[PDB]
Design a protein around this ligand. Structure first.
Ligand SMILES: [Ca+2]
Ligand SMILES: [Ca+2]
Ligand SMILES: [Ca+2]
Ligand SMILES: [Ca+2]
Ligand SMILES: [Ca+2]
Length: 303
């Protein structure tokens, strides 16, 4: 068994895939182990003004991601969260910019980018002091409760909860603000995981921040998903993952993605002995506007 360190240091792959022809970027990755392989969903931006979602074909090795297929979704599930909700034998794809503040689709075969149900409401509430409104949800459960976490591009991280029996369902309208900092410091792309192999419940939160050298992640930890969060690696010079410690040669940004989860279920479990981050990065010298930033997947592996 292993523990999470209070500071982090990684090595990185190069960019793992080029976007489908006609797309500018692949973003906001969510991944699960599936069939002994990896199943990845993502945001895309085209080479014009439009957003969508996609999945990759199954692939076994991270170096196979470059030749995995890229499958555009008919239902746009921007900034998706993929997981298997084991208690009801159902796969969940949570996302934003759907019919309500957050939405989810259901499926029995998550490999089919276009085999999902029509949307169901995941969250119908709003937040104060945000120009974007709610963004970048994730969903995670323990033995009693399912939790919704999200951001607001406003320095704040939010949480909603429901008894686990009630899921899949709408978390409702209410949320609690659980962290608040400068806007750049707790910006977006929040993720929460159960650290496996621990003698007491241990949860890891990462939040994307805007740094002087680029996008990076700050980490927080908690003893309970419904408890308070304490900063862990939470500065740009000693971050969870960023230019300071990523070993990434092709990107300064370490941005919206997913730690590599050890199982696909709602506990969002990670193996601290084999910590890896599937992130979005981009060539530092290409800085177009219009949301055309050429984000690509990359993989950090914890030393
Ligand atoms: Ca985004
Ligand atoms: Ca089951
Ligand atoms: Ca996400
Ligand atoms: Ca209210
Ligand atoms: Ca509230």
């Amino acid at each position: 068994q292993c523990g999470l360190p209070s500071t982090y240091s990684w090595t990185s792959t190069g960019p793992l895939a080029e976007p489908k022809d006609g797309w500018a970027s692949l973003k906001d990755f969510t991944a699960v182990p599936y069939n002994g392989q990896y199943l990845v969903y993502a945001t895309y931006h085209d080479t014009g003004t439009s957003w969508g979602s996609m999945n990759f074909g199954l692939f076994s090795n991270w170096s196979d991601m470059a030749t995995a297929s890229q499958n555009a979704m008919t239902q746009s599930t921007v900034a998706p969260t993929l997981f298997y909700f084991e208690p009801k034998d159902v796969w969940i794809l949570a996302y934003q910019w759907g019919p309500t503040a957050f939405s989810y689709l259901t499926s029995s075969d998550p490999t089919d980018a276009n085999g999902w149900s029509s949307p169901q409401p995941l969250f119908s509430g709003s937040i104060s002091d945000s120009d974007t409104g709610v963004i970048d949800q994730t969903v995670i459960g323990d033995s009693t409760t399912m939790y919704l976490f999200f951001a607001g591009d406003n320095g704040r991280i939010y949480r909603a909860s429901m008894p686990i029996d009630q899921f899949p369902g709408d978390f409702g309208t209410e949320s609690e603000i659980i962290l608040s900092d400068e806007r750049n410091n707790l910006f977006e792309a929040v993720q929460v995981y159960t650290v496996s192999g621990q003698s007491k419940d241990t949860y890891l939160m990462i939040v994307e921040a805007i740094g002087a050298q680029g996008r990076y992640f700050r980490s927080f930890t908690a003893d309970s998903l419904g408890g308070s969060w304490t900063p862990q690696a939470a500065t740009e010079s000693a971050p969870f993952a960023g230019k300071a410690n990523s070993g990434a040669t092709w990107t300064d940004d370490i941005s919206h993605g997913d730690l590599v989860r050890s199982t696909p279920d709602q506990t969002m479990s990670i193996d601290p002995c084999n910590l890896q981050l599937l992130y979005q990065g981009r060539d530092p010298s290409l800085n177009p506007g219009y949301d055309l930033l050429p984000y690509r997947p990359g993989l950090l592996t914890l030393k």
